């Protein structure tokens, strides 16, 4: 596939500008200059500020979804899958500060295009966990989906607490605590 | 009267959403004049915050009462999860206003101060004889509250595909035994 290196450079700068300034104050002139290109060159890659914003959101969502699916699809047992998938989520939120704000701390949810890019994403990650959990479980499929929702919720909320509290314990202790809790439940917390 | 107005305002806010909801519609559905509504609430925002506060208090009081029990840890988990699913069924409007709300720092704080108080309680129970670093104990309490809420929201949003009792037991069993006990 032909690599549009100028597109990727633009998405990187646009991610920072949108997060740092907010959607309203962010401008195409600011984004072009940050990338070191003229505004007409920016328009040869993106049609509008909204199409660029949606491409930025899509890039961060794709990175999260692909990271999670790669964890689920490149492991052979339940426990291993849990370890690698929890790790992948902590890695995403720690390593993609822009992606984290755009997906999880987003105010600009007033328009359907943005809200859809997040709601289709969350459901796809839950679908994947559900596919793995339901297989040879003997569970009613709705109970299996309920568990997948709970498992994703428990993992996301633990990770978000850790990041939002400015990493009060090491990343390793947070990952270990989250995995141990997801695997053994409250019965094995002590 | 105030309580009667909070009940009608809750229905108007749910039916129309915050932005489309109007003080004239709220006064009309309560069978009072608009000036009478204003003798109890200063603005649509003050009324909305009072509505959210009432529903949050009902939920929080139900959850803390469940956590007050001097039984075992799993029994307390069971009574608290039951109390949350019960809140969704007996106060459906409250559940929608707190958890399925499209609509600002005043609103977010009324939900955040609530969530933090319930997490404080779960943390107090979890930290007692676990030997955990307090931040790890709080992290687990956050996860436990989060998964319970998310399981219950799935069940409601999917139009109760299984009975409330089966949903409570499934949520409790997952919270207690974790993924290690899901096939069993
Ligand atoms: C919004 C994206 C959330 C990503 C959450 C990733 C971690 C959840 C744990 C997944 C475990 C898969 C199930 C299994 O191991 O059987
Ligand atoms: C934000 C709404 C709060 C919903 C509360 C759901 C139940 C939480 C689980 C409580 C578990 C108690 C643990 C224990 O006894 O060790």
Numbering used by the authors:
A (entry chain A): 35 to 224
B (entry chain B): 40 to 142, 145 to 225
What's in the article?
We had previously identified the transcription factor FasR, as a key activator of fas and acpS gene expression. fas and acpS, respectively, coding for FAS I synthase and 4-phosphopantetheinyl transferase (essential to produce functional ACP), form a single operon in Mtb. FasR:DNA binding is regulated by long-chain acyl-CoAs, which are themselves products of FAS I, namely acyl-CoAs ≥ C16 disrupt the interaction of Mtb FasR with its cognate DNA6. FasR is a TFR member that senses long and very long acyl-CoA moieties, subsequently turning off FAS I-mediated fatty acid biosynthesis. We have now determined the 3D structures of FasR from Mtb, in three different states obtained with the protein (i) crystallised alone, (ii) co-crystallised in complex with the fatty acid C20-acyl-CoA and (iii) in complex with a double-stranded DNA oligonucleotide bearing the specific FasR-binding sequence.
FasRΔ33 crystals were also grown in the absence of acyl-CoA with the aim of solving the ligand-free structure. Unexpectedly, additional electron density not corresponding to protein, was visible within the ligand-binding tunnel. The density is also consistent with myristic acid (C14), which we hypothesize could likely bind during protein expression in E. coli. Even if the chemical nature of the bound species is not certain, this piece of evidence results in two consequences: FasRΔ33-C14 is not a true apo form of the protein, but it did disclose by serendipity the structure of FasR with a shorter alkyl chain bound in the effector pocket, as compared with FasRΔ33-C20-CoA. In contrast to the strictly symmetric organization of the FasRΔ33-C20-CoA dimer, FasRΔ33-C14 displays one full dimer per asymmetric unit, each protomer deviates from strict symmetry with respect to the other. The HTH domains of FasRΔ33-C14 depart from this relationship, after superimposing one protomer onto the other, the EBDs fit together well, while the HTHs are rotated by ~15°. Departure from intradimer symmetry is thus largely due to substantial flexibility in the region that joins the regulatory and the DNA-binding domains, not the hinge loop covalently linking both domains, but rather the whole region involving the HTH as a rigid domain plus the lower part of the regulatory domain’s helices that interact with the HTH (mainly the N-terminal half of α4). Using the position of conserved Tyr77 Cα as a reference (at the centre of helix α3, key to mediate DNA-binding), the two HTH domains in FasRΔ33-C14 are ~48 Å apart, vs ~57 Å in FasRΔ33-C20-CoA. In contrast, when the tunnel is occupied with a too short acyl chain, greater HTH mobility is enabled, allowing helices α3 to reach a proper separation distance to binding DNA (ideal B-DNA has 34 Å separation between major grooves on the same side of the double helix).
